[PDB]
Amino acid sequence: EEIYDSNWLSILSFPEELRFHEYNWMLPKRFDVRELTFPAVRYKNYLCTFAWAYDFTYHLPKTETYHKSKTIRIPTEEILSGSYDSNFIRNAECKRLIVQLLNKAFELRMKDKEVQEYEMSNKTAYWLEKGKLEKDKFEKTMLVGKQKDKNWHFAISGASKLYPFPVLMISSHIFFTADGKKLIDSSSVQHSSRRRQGKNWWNNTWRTKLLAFIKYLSDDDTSFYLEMGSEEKVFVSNEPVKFKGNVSYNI
């Protein structure tokens, strides 16, 4: 019997209701929902979010006269189980909405903790600045180190999924800086440096760094939270999903 540590963080809890607020005219069309403080997706004339009705007042002063009874809040447990499906919203496209909300919440939460950001081809990764940590070692495993003239940093990227479980998959990456603060602009240089650094990163060099970064993102001893709204929080476990294999081996 062998226990394996995955890169999937369990999503411990969800807000009781997924809300669709009928902002309509109160929401100007020529406005991006990304500048909203809390995650939200413009679906039809509804704003789909886990937040409260008046959490977007600062960005939307015209929503001060919104009526709460126009919300079509949904019992998220039905969404995840699959019970909810109708003409207004489909279970396939209602679970995709929550994934977008969770992804945007993860991005905003990473922005909140002041971790430097590097854009990839498709995703975005969050690395740590030289000097942000105490000597750049969280827990007992170093996250930021040196390699010739390049300061290397450990970065992670998050992506919420609901198919096997409600989980958050994290991908690990290595990034490089010329001075420890500014990122090298050459994609080829970064790729070559990442390959060189990963040449000698074995199982426990990746696993420990991933778990250390996750524990850094933690807010208590059991999980961290993504801020759905002023009152709603999604709790993502800082302990990744563990798998138990019935066969193992030794050196």
Binding site: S6, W202, N204, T205, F243, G245, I251
Partner: protein, 473 residues
């Protein structure tokens, strides 16, 4: 804590009806299935390049030792492994003069230079095949290394050395093997650094392709490819169920014609009467319009499945009792209805999707080693993860370098049994005749279908391509 099952390592069959997990160890001790009396080799290239091939073939004549025999078994020599005479005497040489090979190389246009370079070799190969009495099993084509620098897409030619067809691929290998298909000539392309490399040195002085530790496996793969191309049976599967055709589909882009046209190529594997294993291409390439469809129309799906079923019947006599279609891409309802219309009542059709995209990685609790290969997390009766790339004790390490990504196996269509599907894909990952490795990270139907597609998207003027793999791999 989620349960994680483990599929037993499939066993392949060798001479005298023997079994072994490792292809290299099975060939080194028990030998290949059939008897090839000898391999008559044709060598085309520069006279300087002929010396390299002669020296390397003399090298592989003798047993070869690598750095760590436990991780990578040593090479016991060609004639000891494949009991077949592949000598350096009796090779038919076609010289390519350096002036000729340089005249077309120093060209601004990559497509024209690639076409002319391919023609310079294939014309000599075709003339030797037709108008000469010598018999050759495999035509070993040696190319210089500056050619490899300036004969493929996105190869910016240096300005100081510029001296001086667009319906073909700008890549040498794909066009080369595409234009020889009418004549059915098995060929093997060798870079001058892939062969004797100690002459090729960088600024530091070490060889750029330093294989000082890995001569044994280099020779293993080279010899296995040479034996397969000459008409040999290296090994065969032993766990194939009766009445089961498999088929695997891969889609490729074609830039030659407007719209990528999404050519679809299939590779068919099944069992023959007696105990023989049939594994060939199923190539009627069914081109798909639309830029990113990657799905087959009802007419082309019907044509593909009817061709596969007819090919099975023509060799066994009755239709398959169960078919397991593989694909990198998910099947939609239209093409599956098209497939089921052709399929008879008795045959069971199963559509399986195989992908590496899912970001799952199991890091073990302690120890600088990755997970065992063969572990499977059955998500549900229709979906699972399977670690085709992982640790196996016999090779002394894991097949990957970093933490590997598992294969996501989904029964997209049909019913199937998930454990049986994972048992067959793991078996399919063994029969890679192009590479003499322990096992492949992807089922062989998908990989050889991808190779067939890569070669046939290079030539627009192909017609009724051969179904034997030796003309592509």
């Amino acid at each position: 804590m989620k349960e994680l099952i483990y599929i037993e390592e499939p066993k392949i069959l060798f001479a005298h009806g023997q079994k072994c997990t490792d292809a290299r160890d099975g060939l080194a001790l028990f030998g290949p299935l059939n008897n090839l009396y000898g391999i008559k080799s044709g060598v085309i290239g520069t006279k300087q390049g002929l010396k390299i091939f002669r020296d390397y073939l003399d090298h592989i004549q003798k047993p070869i030792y690598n750095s760590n025999s436990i991780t990578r078994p040593m090479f016991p020599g060609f004639e000891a492994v494949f009991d077949c005479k592949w000598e350096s005497t009796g090779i038919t040489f076609k010289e390519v003069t350096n002036e000729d090979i340089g005249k077309f190389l120093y060209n601004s246009s990559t497509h024209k230079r690639t076409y002319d370079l391919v023609s310079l070799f294939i014309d000599k190969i075709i003339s030797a095949n037709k108008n000469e009495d010598e018999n050759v099993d495999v035509w070993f084509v040696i190319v210089p290394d500056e050619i490899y620098k300036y004969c493929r897409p996105n190869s910016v030619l240096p300005k100081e050395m510029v001296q001086t067809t667009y319906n073909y691929d700008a890549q040498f290998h794909d066009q080369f093997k595409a234009r020889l298909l009418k004549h059915t000539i098995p060929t093997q392309i060798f870079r001058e650094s892939t062969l004797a490399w100690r002459d090729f040195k960088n600024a530091f002085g070490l060889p750029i392709r330093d294989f000082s530790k890995i001569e044994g496996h280099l020779a293993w793969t080279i010899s296995t490819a040479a034996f397969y191309k000459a008409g040999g049976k290296p090994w065969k599967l032993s766990d194939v169920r009766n009445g089961v055709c498999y088929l695997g589909l891969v889609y490729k882009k074609v830039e030659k014609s407007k719209n990528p046209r999404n050519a679809c190529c299939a590779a068919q594997m099944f069992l023959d009467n007696g105990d023989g294993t049939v594994f060939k291409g199923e190539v009627g390439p069914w081109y798909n319009p639309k830029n990113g469809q990657y799905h087959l129309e009802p007419k082309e799906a019907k044509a593909l499945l009817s061709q596969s079923l007819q090919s099975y019947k023509e060799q066994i006599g009755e239709y398959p009792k169960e078919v397991f279609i593989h694909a990198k891409t998910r099947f939609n309802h239209q093409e599956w209805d098209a497939f089921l219309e052709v399929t008879p009542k008795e045959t069971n059709l199963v559509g399986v999707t195989i992908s590496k995209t899912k970001p799952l990685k199991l890091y073990k609790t302690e120890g600088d080693y990755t997970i065992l290969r063969g572990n499977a997390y059955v998500v549900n009766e229709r979906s699972a993860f399977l670690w085709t790339v992982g640790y196996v004790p016999k090779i002394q390490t894991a097949l990957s370098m970093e933490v590997p990504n598992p294969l996501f196996i989904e029964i997209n269509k049909g019913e199937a049994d998930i454990k049986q599907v994972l048992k067959d894909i793991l078996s399919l990952t063994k029969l890679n005749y192009n590479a003499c490795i322990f096992a492949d990270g992807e089922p062989v139907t998908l990989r050889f279908a991808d190779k067939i597609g890569e070669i046939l998207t290079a030539s627009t003027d192909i017609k009724t391509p051969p179904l034997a793999f030796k003309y592509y791999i």
